[PDB]
Design a protein around this ligand. Sequence first.
Ligand SMILES: OC[C@H]1O[C@@H](O[C@H]2[C@H](O)[C@H](O)[C@H](O[C@H]3[C@H](O)[C@H](O)[C@H](O)O[C@@H]3CO)O[C@@H]2CO)[C@@H](O)[C@@H](O)[C@@H]1O
Length: 309
Amino acid sequence: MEFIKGFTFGWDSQKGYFKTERAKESLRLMQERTASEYVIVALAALQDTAHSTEVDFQGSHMVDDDELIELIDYAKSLGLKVILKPTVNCRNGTWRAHINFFDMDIPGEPTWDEWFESYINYQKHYAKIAEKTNCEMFVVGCEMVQAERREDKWRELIAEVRKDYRGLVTYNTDKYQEDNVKFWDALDVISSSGYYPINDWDRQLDRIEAVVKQYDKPFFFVAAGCPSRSGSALLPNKWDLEGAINLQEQADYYQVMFEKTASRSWVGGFGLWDWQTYLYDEKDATKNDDYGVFGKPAERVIKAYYQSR
Ligand SMILES: OC[C@H]1O[C@@H](O[C@H]2[C@H](O)[C@H](O)[C@H](O[C@H]3[C@H](O)[C@H](O)[C@H](O)O[C@@H]3CO)O[C@@H]2CO)[C@@H](O)[C@@H](O)[C@@H]1O
């Protein structure tokens, strides 16, 4: 596995966004400003709650198949490789890591089998798209901490994705959960959300290295990044962190992350979080306290690092 110089795109997208000039201009700027060679197209279906079993990928929250194919083809026309990452959010705001059901099937209660049926059929739909567009990698789940114990069901899902899609298949675990997953052998690549504190990379990388050396798979941080807010460098996963704007903290987070990971040969790349489909005006960058790096000092740190690899 060559080093993946990646950036996540499309998380803010709604139906119709990918049809637009604005979306293509944003993706061109992502490539120009960061020297990324991969785009991670991150999409989210919706379910009602963390304990409901129907996964909706057809409403206004979800780009249509035709515009998704258009955007992937356009990314390829720019020379980008594409990683497709379809995940799921809850309408009531609960983090998908809490999606969970009773260990036993109780009459009248939602079951693991019902949820996985809906989720597998969701993934198979997008696996067919990844196959038709020749996406380089497909990510079958993201941060599903409580669902990860259902190893049998995850193995079933991966086999179903394999029937539709012949590329690389991975699963994206949450921070600190790299060893919670017991089905890495069924995947091609190990990946995690590397939202680790700026002052704890040495301990965390040593921990992950010991996990990764138990398998014969490449590894990368399919999500990583930091909002431009004070205190975010300590908890970079908290998108709602109460903190004043701080562009330099985000740049410093990135500088430390690349420095610490550059010396671990097994860190095989990054899918940096994240680049908006509808990008803010460069004039508004110094007021933006979110994950974007457009117009911020972190943009130069990323581009320099990606150009060096
Ligand atoms: O932006 C409006 C939209 O935001 C939803 O909530 C978001 C967050 O705003 C943020 O994008 C967050 O990103 C997580 C992501 O879920 C995943 O964990 C990734 O690895 O890390 C990023 C950064 O922490 O995602 C949630 C949605 O899951 C929500 O508030 C909507 O109501 C709303 O319109």
